[PDB]
């Protein structure tokens, strides 16, 4: 009898779907968590100056290891066992 | 309008949530909502919103 013109979720006229009591509680629970999130970030242990290059050898070593692993890309060795192992196809019981 | 804004017993207010970018709400809000504090929507002004 009463229709929502066009699509019911887009356009100038939409569905009057209201906010429920359960939805309000979900927002509050996330807000309480985020209120705690921005408190533990408030007071750093070290200042900006005291952390200047505190861990740079490890960063340099990590990048060097990345170069070393990526530079080892090369075709694998080829051995006689792989080629001579094909003759075992016609192995028989004499 | 100031006494009702000072004695409000609700910990969360539109000014606090929008400015601090809580819940990633800036994706939904407009940049003008930082100044409007949620009291203005389009050309409509609701004086009862704190």
């Amino acid at each position: 009898r009463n229709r929502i013109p066009g699509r019911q979720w887009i356009g100038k006229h939409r569905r009057p779907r209201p906010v429920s009591a359960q939805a309000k509680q979900n927002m509050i629970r996330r807000l309480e968590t985020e209120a705690e999130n921005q408190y533990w970030l408030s007071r750093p242990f070290l200042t900006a100056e005291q952390e200047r290059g505190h861990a740079a050898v490890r960063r340099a070593a990590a990048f060097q290891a990345l170069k070393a692993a990526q530079a080892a890309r090369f075709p694998a060795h080829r051995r006689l066992e792989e080629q001579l192992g094909h003759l075992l196809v016609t192995r028989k019981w004499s | 309008q100031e006494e009702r804004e000072r004695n409000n017993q609700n910990p969360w207010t539109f000014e606090r949530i929008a400015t601090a970018n809580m819940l990633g709400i800036r994706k939904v809000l407009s940049p003008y909502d930082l100044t409007h504090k949620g009291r203005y929507w389009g050309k409509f002004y609701t004086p009862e919103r704190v």
């Binding site: 100038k12 939805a23 | 017993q9 609700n10 939904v28 407009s30 949620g38």
Partner: peptide
């Protein structure tokens, strides 16, 4: 889509409606 300012109380995004309902004013009791 409609302009930023309209004449028909532009319907808010559903996430924004929850924001407008959780940031209400509670008078002291």
């Amino acid at each position: 889509g409609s302009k930023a300012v309209t004449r028909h109380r532009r319907v808010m995004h559903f996430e924004r409606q929850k924001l407008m309902a959780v940031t209400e004013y509670i008078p002291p009791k």
